[PDB]
Structure formats: C-alpha cells, structure tokens
C-alpha cells in the first residue's frame, strides 16, 4: 500500500490568486500522480493525468509539476469556480490510492447574514409537534454563532442545525437553525427569539416573534 | 459525451447485500478497466477495485476482499458491484470510474451512488410550510421533517424558481431525517404571485406540493 498526503487540507484564497496544492507520496511513484477535482455535490472530473503537466480537455489555468515522491497540482488565475476539493492519485503500486483532499475556498468580503425567524406551521401543529425555524444566509465568514431565547431564556435543547458549502455565485454561506418543542410547550410561551452571532456586527442580528401578535 | 449512469439501490437492512448499477456507454464497454471507489462521509476516497469488462480480470483492495464483488455484463453494457455483509460502516457513496489505458487515472466518473445499509423503515417526508411571520426581499421556505432514508427533492416553482434558493444539507435526529430549504423573492413577486416548494422523496414515492400563504 501507498500512502498519499497532501498537506494541508483545507485553503483559502482571493480571486485572481495563484495556489499550489502539494501532494506527497510513501515512495517514488515513476511518475504515477494524477489529479482530480470534486466540486460539492459529489461532481468529479480528472484534472491531470501521468505526473501531473498533462491535461485532458480541462483549463489550461491547472498545471502541476513533480517527481518521485512529490508533485502538486497548481491553479494559477483563481475563477469563482474553482472553489471545491482536490485529489491527487497514485496509478503505479497496488492498491491503487488517493490522497487526503483540499477544500479550496475563496475569500470575499466580510458580510452579515440575513437572518429570518418562522413560526410552527398551521398543519404541524395539528399534530402535536411546535419546530421554530431561522435562517442565516449569505454570511462570510462561515464562522458564525446562533442562539435561541424562548421568552427570554435558554437553547442547548431541541435545536439543530446545519451548514452549507460555500456558495459558487457568491462565495458566501448560510446557516440553518431548528428549534423544536411539543406543541404543548410552544404553546407555554410567547416569545420566540433566534439571536445570530457573527464577527460583522458587534451586536447579534436578532429575529424573534411573540403568539398572540400572530 | 462518454459518461457512466450510475445508482444502484440505496437501502438494505444491515447484514444483507446490495448491487449497486454502473451503466458505461460512451465508448467501447469492453475495451478499458471499470473502476469502484468509495467515500464516506468522513471524506477518505478509498480505492476498492477494477474489473476488465472482456476477460473477467480484477484487482480488489486487500480490504474490501471478500466485501465485494465485481460483475461482468458485455451485452447491456453495465458494471457490477455487490456488496454483502453489509453493516453500518458500507453505509457510504460509492463510485465507478473509467480508467484510460496507458496511465492508471480515472478520467470519466459516473455520479456515483449513495448506500444506505440500515434497518430502519422508510418514511413519507411531512411538508410544512414557512410563511414570513412578523407582516425588496422576502424569505420563505418548506421545512421537510421526519422521513427516511435519503434522500429528497426540493424544488421551487417546479424548477422555475432557482435563484436565492437554499437547501440545507439533513440531520437526522433519531432515525430520522429533517431538512429544510429557503427562498428569496423580490417582495413585489410574493404573495402578489404564487410560490410553492415541491419535494420529492422516491424511498415512500410521495410527491408534494405545498405553496406558502400569508399569515402562518
């Protein structure tokens, strides 16, 4: 077996940026590194084949260089297109082996989300159930924070979320949040509040609502 | 354009097995190596095998020896992979590939499929809408609660409304999975005009459609 690193695993860049994606091998590999790229949605096409330098019908902004143990792949104008992971393989020794990956992402303007707080739905209530959606969207950095406050209090229980991959039209992410309760304890409050916390507001974007406005 | 339409069957109790399809047509089926590869969610894309469609050939990993199999098929054109005592570790994506003689690189990918090894009874998606609460652009949404397995389809306006959409990756809870998607409209557009999210989820065949209205 052949292991395959690549160094690091996750980068960050501007556009217009020239990156290098390095790539290592257990051993002299002949020449036997092949790059790939896997955009989100688990779309993946070959990048280079044979040690890197050759193509096969793709941009001609990707080239990589290498011998024996190292090669990389190299992207040289960075286009608000590139952002996904890249491979790097092995096609020599058996069994055939891929390297770790590298996220590559491309850093825009700091932004705040749009936040939107939605209450439980005619139709779920009718069946016992009480969930508070929030959206978050269209934030960078992905690094933000969210908190719920039911009358004025506490989260930690019934709330989960969930990330996106980072947008290819707007390198921008957005940010899902779920508070769930029984209906009957929805129903034991009247405040409902989604605090976000990003690093664009030195105050939390809030969103919230109360029952009998509504 | 040569290509591999994949997707075998995506879910089978833990302990039984499973023949995820490979469809290769866009070149001579027989003439060069198939390729399987696998990627679980903790993002390692492990090689597994190769099987030549003429001779019967093959070379397994000596890891999933005996954890797979590879089948033939000259006549449709169509790679094989079974993949027997299942448990929750197959549970994964699984890809066939192409490799280009001369070179060992995989130059055309199918789609690849998503296994699902588990013994959890399939489940219709409840759809409840998100309608703005507090009375340009507005958001709204579908919230998609409780449905198993993977995955679902969630579109707006029957696919014509595509942009300032947001659809969040499941999260499942206990058994369940839970997803949600968002939609932003110039104000103008809602409700002075119809909105509705349509989601589709095979596993239970269930197709539906709820439109958001005014006021919850």
């Known amino acids: 077996d052949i292991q395959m690193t690549q160094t690091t695993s996750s980068l960050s860049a501007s556009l217009g940026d020239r990156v290098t994606i390095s790539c290592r091998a257990s051993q002299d590999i002949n020449n036997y590194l092949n790059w790939y790229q896997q955009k989100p949605d688990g779309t993946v096409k070959i990048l280079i084949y044979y040690t890197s330098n050759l193509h096969s019908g793709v941009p001609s902004r990707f080239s990589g260089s290498g011998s024996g143990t190292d090669y990389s792949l190299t992207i040289s104008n960075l286009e608000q297109e590139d952002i996904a992971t890249y491979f790097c393989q092995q096609g020599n020794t058996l069994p055939r082996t891929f390297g770790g990956g590298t996220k590559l992402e491309i850093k825009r303007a700091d932004a705040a989300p749009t936040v939107s707080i939605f209450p439980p739905s005619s139709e779920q209530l009718t069946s016992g159930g009480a969930s508070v959606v929030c959206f978050l969207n269209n934030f960078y950095p992905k690094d933000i924070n969210v908190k719920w406050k039911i009358d004025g209090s506490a989260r930690q229980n019934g709330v989960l979320n969930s990330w996106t991959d980072q947008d290819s039209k707007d390198s921008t992410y957005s940010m899902s949040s779920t508070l769930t309760l029984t209906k009957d304890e929805y129903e034991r409050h009247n405040s409902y509040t989604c605090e976000a916390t990003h690093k664009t507001s030195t105050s939390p974007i809030v969103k919230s609502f109360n029952r009998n406005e509504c | 354009q040569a290509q591999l339409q994949q997707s075998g069957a995506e879910l089978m109790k833990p302990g039984a097995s499973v023949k995820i399809s490979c469809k290769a047509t866009g070149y001579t089926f027989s003439n060069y190596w198939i390729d399987w590869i696998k990627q679980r969610p903790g993002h390692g894309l492990e090689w597994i095998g190769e099987?030549?469609?003429?001779?019967?050939?093959?070379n397994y990993n000596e890891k999933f020896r005996g954890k797979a199999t590879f089948t033939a098929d000259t006549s449709s054109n169509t790679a094989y992979m079974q993949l027997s005592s299942l448990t929750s570790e197959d549970s994964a994506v699984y890809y066939c590939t192409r490799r280009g003689y001369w070179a060992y690189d995989f130059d055309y990918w199918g789609q690849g499929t998503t296994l699902t090894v588990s013994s959890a009874k399939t489940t219709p998606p409840s759809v409840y809408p998100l309608a703005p609460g507090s009375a340009s652009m507005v958001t709204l949404g579908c919230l998609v609660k409780g449905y198993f397995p993977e995955p679902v389809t969630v579109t707006w306006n029957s696919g014509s409304l595509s942009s300032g959409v947001h659809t969040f990756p499941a999260v499942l809870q206990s058994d369940l999975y839970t997803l949600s998607s968002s939609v932003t409209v110039p104000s103008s557009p809602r409700p002075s005009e119809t909105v509705t999210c349509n989601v589709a989820h095979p596993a239970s065949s269930t197709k539906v459609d709820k439109k958001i209205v005014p006021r919850d």
């Open positions: 099987i030549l469609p003429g001779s019967g050939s093959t």
